[PDB]
């Protein structure tokens, strides 16, 4: 078997671990910002009509 | 204190307050020359780092009867309002040099309009 | 085509006409103005304004 | 033998110099007619005499490339 | 690393990578579009965000009434090129044969036929200098995506061999983060230039 | 036997000169349409004739490269 | 033997010219959309036709690079 | 033997052209966001768009240099 | 034989491209922080992003120079 | 023989230098008579003496290229 | 043989790139300190880190030239 | 032997340097006359002594080209 | 045999890089002291530390070209 | 035998770098003259020490070129 496969796959896994410690906080906050923004657009629209 | 007039000058000399600039005995119908030299001295004395701000005090001609008293802030130009059609110029040396030469003239025109 | 000149003092308007070439000089240097010019601001030096003719000497000036 | 790439380096360097100089001239003439449009014929006539003045020497470089290739 | 073709006509491994990227794109699409929800959450908000992103790009290039049709071609094109660039990075396996399962976009024929398919579509919905500019922009789009993936594929592979043969984790880590960056930037410039030529030929 | 190297440096230097010249012309003309929009057609025509000049010298460079590789 | 190096200088000089031209065009359209951001499509279409020019002459250079390679 | 430095000048001129084009684009983006901070997301977006466009044609020179090293 | 010359000109042209691009982007960010000094962290972070994105292709030129040296 | 390569190179670099210098002088005189058109004859005449001054030495290189082709 | 020519062309291209890039950075920072002279330490720290980058890629170019000279 | 192309490449690089330097200085004399046309004597005398300065080292190079051609 | 030509291209490229760098630095400081005349000593001290800072690597390129001439 | 080529390219690259550097410094020092007349002595003293700086390395280059031709 080749040696490069498990080597670069292991470092891809540890790169995803570093990107998990670094990167789950921004994009989940971007998705939460979009979700709260569209919930306020909809929620606001519903509230005002009533 | 920068007085324009003899009445205010004698007022602040009776009450012992420091008066730098003084201008005395204007015409009934004043042109831009006399107020130009004292407004140039005033704005250049702001530019020396002395005043750090200054205010005007005059009687606004609302009507023939009213003549309300206004406190107007001359410098710095923080309360500057935007016009209708905001257009962009090509600042020919640079914008900072034309501001360096132009904002004293705006302050002098404010003093002459007041 | 012509461009509309109006030299304005705090004391009042001095000159107002339609002049083809305006040849004022700034603090940097000369400026030759034709109709269709770019919007620009430039402070004038204490010298004559060449309007092509009638020459207007300005003081202060902008 | 090597006269063909002699001819070709002559044409290539002449084309590079003509390209850079002509690009500078044309770029300044369109920003000139952009900032004030009323002088388009004057600026185009002096631009065309300028580009003829630039490419005068690469064209004689091309005919010198011809007599290099013939060598 | 030779072109392993079981059939003489066509490359077998490229067809395998096209099938696996089509199935993974289809299953992430149906996983993001499971049910209808008026309050977006989970992955449906992500699919709607990509949908409005493509729409925004269309709105930048053309009028919304003309380019409204292209939105569902554009979103599957950006997601298809996105996954097709990111497949080459994790495994890139070597078998005892020539080569197997690198990535689809590293093959030049795949990217050039995808670019000429794009330009065939924008001719379908829509004088020698114009047609040589047309063939120029086809081949520079295909060569753009092909080169900017294939150089990174070779470099990553080289790094993998240098590590395995004889300490060198962080250079390929920095390059591999830069390579997923190159993958998403190449997908975005590919779909954006697609919509630019679509807007240029429609209106 | 160096005609392939000849034609290739000729095409390469012509491409470099045309790239820099076209980059200068197009960059200054998009600055010209950016500082004022209302005469974009006036700017584009002089831009295209400048592009025509700064590529028409490397176009005859490319044709001369063809007759270089022919010899 | 030398056709490989011929194709190589051809693609290298084409890449250098296209890189400088595209860099100039996209640089000045960055400052164009920074001065006046409401002019983004009218800057963008002229940007892409300039990119088309400054690539399309090195693109026919790199198309010719393969027939340089074969010989 | 000659294909090695063929590939080397190809990747070197590609790196030179991409470095100059990337430098022009990125420098103008950061001076544009220095002019005003309110448009730095759209200027970073068009920054990465520009970097891709100027780093695109040198990398086809890179992969063609690998083709040249192959032959 | 030619591999060491290949390696050296590859890393040298990579150094030239990275030097010109980094010089442009760093010079414009220091005139940007000289223009508005309260924008210094945003300007230097986008400048380091620019250092990475102009030194992308010279760094790959360096490892391909090591490939060229190895052959 | 190699004197043909000598002369062509001298002719080519003289054309490149004259092209860049003439492009600079003509482009800046386009801007100069574009900003103040009433001055046009005196600055175009000193532009022409600058033209003769910038292409004095490439004509000397052309004559020396005739000498080198003779050798 | 070719190793000393390799080492020297690597040092030469690294020196030329460092010279142009550091000249751009130092020149723009002294004109920036000419604009606002109260920003001396910020401009000096930023020019020092920018020069550190622009020098440090030809620094590894120079040590690679040393291992080229060894081979 | 190859001293003829030695002499010619000395002539060519001296012509390129003199062309760029003379083009820059006489172009910005035109720009300075356009800014202020009443200091034409002092601008032209500083121009011509700057022309002497930029032209001096290529003339020294071309007389050494004469001493190089012989050898 | 090639060590003398190696030392020559090393000193020459270091000279060209130092020339462009010192030209940029002294040119921008001469317009800087042309703008604010009372800033002359600070501008000169930063200019001379910049000149030494940009000729740091060309002079070590020269003293490495000496051992290139030896080896 | 190639020492003549070595010395000639050393002189040529020194002349090209000195020409660009002197062109930059003389060009915007006459810009500084044209903006304001009264600083002519301090502008010319900084000018000539800049001429000394951008010519010093070039001078060293031609002396070392005579050393190379002696080798």
Numbering used by the authors:
A (entry chain b1): 7 to 56
B (entry chain G): 115 to 228
C (entry chain H): 2 to 53, 58 to 67
D (entry chain c5), F (entry chain c6), G (entry chain c7), H (entry chain c8), I (entry chain c9), J (entry chain c4), ...: 2 to 72
E (entry chain a): 6 to 131, 152 to 191, 198 to 234
What do the authors report?
Adenosine triphosphate (ATP) synthases are multi-subunit protein complexes that use an electrochemical proton motive force across a membrane to make the cell’s supply of ATP from adenosine diphosphate (ADP) and inorganic phosphate (Pi). Proton translocation across the membrane-embedded FO region of the complex occurs via two offset half-channels. The passage of protons causes rotation of a rotor subcomplex, inducing conformational change in the catalytic F1 region to produce ATP while a peripheral stalk subcomplex holds the F1 region stationary relative to the spinning rotor during catalysis. The F1 region consists of subunits α3β3γδε, while the FO region is usually formed by three subunits with the stoichiometry ab2c9-15.
We determined structures of intact ATP synthase from Bacillus PS3 in three rotational states by cryo-EM. Three conformations corresponding to different rotational states of the enzyme were identified by ab-initio 3D classification and refined to high resolution. The 3D classes contain 45, 35, and 20% of particle images and the overall resolutions of the corresponding cryo-EM maps were 3.0, 3.0, and 3.2 Å, respectively. As expected, the most striking difference between the three rotational states of the Bacillus PS3 structure is the angular position of the rotor (subunits γεc10). The structure of the ATP synthase, with three αβ pairs in the F1 region and 10 c-subunits in the FO region, results in symmetry mismatch between the 120° steps of the F1 motor and 36° steps of the FO motor. By comparing the positions of equivalent c-subunits in different rotational states, the observed rotational step sizes in the three rotational states of the ATP synthase appear to be almost exactly 3, 4 and 3 c-subunits. Bacillus PS3 ATP synthase is found in a conformation that has been proposed to allow ATP synthesis while ATP hydrolysis is auto-inhibited. In this state, subunit ε maintains an up conformation and inserts into the αDPβDP interface, forcing βDP to adopt an open conformation (lower, dashed box). In contrast, all three non-catalytic sites in the cryo-EM map are occupied by Mg-ATP, while a Mg-ADP molecule and a weak density tentatively assigned to phosphate are found in the βTP site and by the p-loop of βE, respectively. The cryo-EM maps show that a clash between subunit ε and βTP blocks the central rotor turning in the direction of ATP hydrolysis while it is still free to turn in the direction of ATP synthesis, which could explain the ability of subunit ε to selectively inhibit ATP hydrolysis.
